[PDB]
């Protein structure tokens, strides 16, 4: 599914990401725009042997299990395939777990280079949510 911006904003807000552990809404929308261009089916093979799945590019070394990555820890107890869905629920549930660590949103490299220090609330402006 490739989500619209406003459409992603209102979905994420239904899924409880506005102000979750200190990150405002715009953070999440911006992250998804640079991490996967709002495409729920996006996948990226990493050089280390891991793959990044879905709209928030969740990594198979640490968070989900794709059955093909060496020191796989599966910290979100979920097959990676579950994050390639139009329903964002499992992606959000895992993302909520990832950000509850002291690194916060810094786990997401695109958000880190393109979102942190930017007016991230621009991403939810001009939307009915």
């Amino acid at each position, epitope marked *: 599914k490739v989500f619209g911006r406003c459409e992603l904003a209102a979905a994420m807000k239904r899924h*409880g990401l*506005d102000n979750y552990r200190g990150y405002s809404l715009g953070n999440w929308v911006c992250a998804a725009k640079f991490e996967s261009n709002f495409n729920t089916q996006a996948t990226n093979r990493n050089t280390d042997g891991s793959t990044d799945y879905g709209i928030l590019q969740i990594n198979s070394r640490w968070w989900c299990n794709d059955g093909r990555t060496p020191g796989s820890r599966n*910290l979100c107890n979920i097959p990676c395939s579950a994050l390639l869905s139009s329903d964002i629920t499992a992606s959000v549930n895992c993302a909520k*777990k990832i950000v509850s*660590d*002291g690194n916060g949103m810094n786990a997401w490299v695109a958000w880190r280079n393109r979102c942190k220090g930017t007016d991230v609330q621009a991403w939810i402006r001009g939307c009915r949510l």
Partner: antibody
Amino acid sequence: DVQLQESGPSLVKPSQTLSLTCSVTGDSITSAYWSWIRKFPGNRLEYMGYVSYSGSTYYNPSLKSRISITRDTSKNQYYLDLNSVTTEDTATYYCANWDGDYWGQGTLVTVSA
Amino acid sequence: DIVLTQSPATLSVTPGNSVSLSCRASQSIGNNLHWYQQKSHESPRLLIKYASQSISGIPSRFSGSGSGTDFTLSINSVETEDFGMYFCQQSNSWPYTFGGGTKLEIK
């Protein structure tokens, strides 16, 4: 499958440090998210803190910095250290994973002179 | 901190009726409200996550709804295995907090 278990003293003197251990079987404690919760007499539950994947920790400010949570990768246990206890620390302590789906059984710790 | 208030504090029910328990949050916490059950001489058991997400292995008669500040947990026809304490908890902010609990008892 995951199995958790608390252990330690059931009786402590005021002002000492209460130390508790949680043994995990069925998964490496390394990298995972682990917590401690307590239930006071009168059913109040207090979330005490958690350790996470990077090793960062989050502690309830009600504990005013007398808490430490620590893990030892080789024995596959993680710990609770609570300094200067008082009678207000009397309670049922539980160990549990962050997700809340595996809890140990609990251990009553009474603080008395 | 986010204070979570539960009502009623006590609820008696003859097995087979339906019941719903509230949990109100002092501030909006989105969908970040979970529910637990605690029977006597036992550990709390996760029933519902993220306000309405079902959890494998728990009876389908339990269900939750709400968002923002108002959450409810419903029990379709109380079975005698259901009596005990019910607690809600939020994970939106740090320190995580629990509500005062509701006691569910045979009438």
